[model samples]
Target chain A: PQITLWKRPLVTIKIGGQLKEALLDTGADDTVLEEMSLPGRWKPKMIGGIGGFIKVRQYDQILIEICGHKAIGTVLVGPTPVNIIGRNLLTQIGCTLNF
Target chain B: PQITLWKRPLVTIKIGGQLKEALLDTGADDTVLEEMSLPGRWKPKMIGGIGGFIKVRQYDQILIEICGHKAIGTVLVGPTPVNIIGRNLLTQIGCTLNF
Candidate 1:
C-alpha cells in the first residue's frame, strides 16, 4: 500500500483513564473516539458523512499528544473499527501535509 | 429537522481572500471546507472511510476562525458535495458536546 509518510502523526489520548494511540488525519473532519474504547459520559448527536450521517450519543474529553505535542479536546465514542486523528487537531498545530 | 442545541459551534475560514462560515462538529472527525471554496495549493492523498478510501488530489490552506477563535490548517478539495468541520478542530479548542 502507498502511504504519505507524514500526513500527520498518530498520538495517544487518555480515555476512561487509559491511553490509546490514534492517527492524526487531516482528511477526517471531526474527532472520533471509538465508543467501545470510551471511558466516560457522552451526548448524542447525528453526524453527516460521505455516505450519510449517523446519530452518536457518547464521547469523552482528554489530553491528546501528537508527535509529542499535546492539547485537550472531546473525542467521539462510537462503534469505530479504527482510531483516527482529524483536521481539527492539525489546524491547531499549523501543520499541513507535505506531498 | 431535530437539532441538538449544544453539539458544537461553526466558524469561518479565509481562502483565496474569501471568508466562508462552516460548522465545527466534534461529531465529525476531520476538518473539511467546500471543494469549490478552496484556494491556492494542495496535494493528493488516498483516504479511507466507512465504505472505503478515495483518492483525493488538490487542496489548500488558510486561516480558520471558529467561535471567534482562529487557527491555521489545511482544507480538502475535490468534488465534495458539502463542507464539514471535524474532530481535529474540536480537540484543539478543548470543547465537547453538552447535550
Candidate 2:
C-alpha cells in the first residue's frame, strides 16, 4: 500500500518481540528510539538533529518488521520523543519515495 | 522518479523566489528552513525536535515549488541544520511511500 503524506507516516513495527509505533523518517540517517531493552552489547554513540545532539546506545544487527516487511539493521536507543525508523532500515525494507 | 531510501531524500525547492535544497521529511509535521529572507508578515513561533525547541518566524500562505510540484502553506524560518519539506508540502506534491 502506498503511504500518503497527509499525516505523519507512522507505522506499526515489531522489534525485540514487542509491537511498537514509529515514524518512517526519510530525512533521518539512523533509526532512533526511546529507552528500551535490546539484546547484545551496545556501543555509545551520539546523533545530531535539528537543534542539538544527544548520546545514544547503538545496537547493531537488530531485527525489525515494519508494515509486514522484515529488515535487520542498526537501531539507536536514546531520549527521543518518538521512535524513528530512518533510512538505515528503510532501505533494507525496500522503501521508496514516489510522487 | 521513485526515490530509494539509500540516501537522503533531498530535492531542489523554489521558495521566496530562491532555489534551495530541502529534505522530504515524512516525520515532520511542519516545514522548517534555515535562516532565509521571506516576504510578508510573520509571527513568532516555537517548534520542538529531538533535543529541544527553537524559536522561529512563521510565515503563512507562502508559495513553494518542490520537484516540479507547487504548494502553498506556512513556512518557518530559523536556525536549522537543514531545510525540511514536511508532510504539509509533501502531500501537496502527491508524495507517497511505496515499497
Question: Which candidate achieves the best DockQ against the true structure?
Answer: 2
- Write one digit per residue (lDDT tens) for candidate 2, span A1-99: 789988788999999889999999998899998899999999998898876899999999999999899998899999998999999998988899999
lDDT per residue (tens digit) for residues B17-96 in model 1: 66677664433455655556555667876654533455555454456665545556655554444556555654544443
Choose the strongest candidate by lDDT.
2
Model 2 lDDT tens row, B37-83: 99999999989888788899999999999989999999999988899
For candidate 2 chain A, which ten residues in a row score worst on lDDT? Answer: A45-54
In order, what are the TM-scores of chain A for the candidates? 0.64, 0.97
True contacts kept of each: 0.02, 0.89
In order, candidate lDDTs are 0.52, 0.92
List TM-scores for all candidates, in order.
Answer: 0.43, 0.98
Instruction: Provide the lDDT at A4 for model 2.
Output: 92
